[PDB]
Amino acid sequence: QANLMRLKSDLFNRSPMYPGPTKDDPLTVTLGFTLQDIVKVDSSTNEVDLVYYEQQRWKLNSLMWDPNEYGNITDFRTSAADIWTPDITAYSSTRPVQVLSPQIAVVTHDGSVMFIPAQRLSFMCDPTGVDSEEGVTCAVKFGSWVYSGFEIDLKTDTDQVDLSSYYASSKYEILSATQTRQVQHYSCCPEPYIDVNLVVKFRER
Amino acid sequence: QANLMRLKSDLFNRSPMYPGPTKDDPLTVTLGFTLQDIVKVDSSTNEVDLVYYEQQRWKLNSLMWDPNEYGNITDFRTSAADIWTPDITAYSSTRPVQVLSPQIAVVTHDGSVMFIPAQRLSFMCDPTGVDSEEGVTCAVKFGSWVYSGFEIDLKTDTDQVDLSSYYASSKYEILSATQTRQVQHYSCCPEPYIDVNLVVKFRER
């Protein structure tokens, strides 16, 4: 009965603003995608426009609370601005992403956060063959812009992009869509680099 | 006179900035659309552009007052940023919505709010058959981004969609338009998911 107001307060008002992870206080992000539609294919530029929902989930100690102390409150919704959010970027976009949905997140009492913004993304993609029965394949990597794998570990729960709500009358028919964790090693440096690779295969309907 | 400057201050200066609904404190949002224009059809992508007024209505205890204490004031207009508003979204958009009108609401002493923003929406729509006599049917679902049917319950006011001020000389003639509330249950989960389905059937004029 509005002890929620009390909670949002002492969580977001007493000292800490969370300064991000480190090699000493590392963090795991779970990434999944839901492909809604391939909107545009541009042959003159090599660009492709996607609408997908990017599900993102992590866990912070600094967000934990005893629900007994707060009217048996187990979770709440707050705007993503009120909180730290990881810096997961598409590595081959060609235009700033466009937010299609409200940017509200759910924080649970065990300190876990989930956050699913709908986005439109233009990225580098050669659509030659889209015309044929075989179609064409495009990939785009997502990863942190500033944090190594020792700082942000990036993982998925399934190889399979969710297609269960792909637009049934799209110009484009999906033949295959997959998300997979990749690790790169560099001989200078002991820390691994991580990305999730989104590969979609598709053709004209 | 000058009684309103006090009420506004008394409302927008007490701790309660409304934190949104909860399963314990559910909220009803009423949804109604006024079709102004189908502006654009794009057959190479599958997008359609609509101009519409979206009438939103809801009621909060936190916005009740007694007129007898406030110079017999029964209601006031205020900027929509001065208040909480629901996260009602088009689930199949393809671009950030464009706001066409000012964003001002009327609050009433019973705590009821009404808000009528004008908007341009791009959403997914296969326009095949639009040049025929039967035309083509398209649909857009609107719903909350973060709240289930146990937190935001979605409704419509007027049975019928308001076509009375649809642009008479539009490129596209409206054959029908309907707006219906809809409930679904998934196998996993007992709570309902609710949308308002705006189904419009149209043809080239």
């Binding site: 599900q55 759910v106 | 973060v146």
Partner: peptide, 16 residues
Amino acid sequence: GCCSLPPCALNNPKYC
């Protein structure tokens, strides 16, 4: 299913 609808995913985090 549930998980391709954000309100549903958000309300069922462990499942989704």
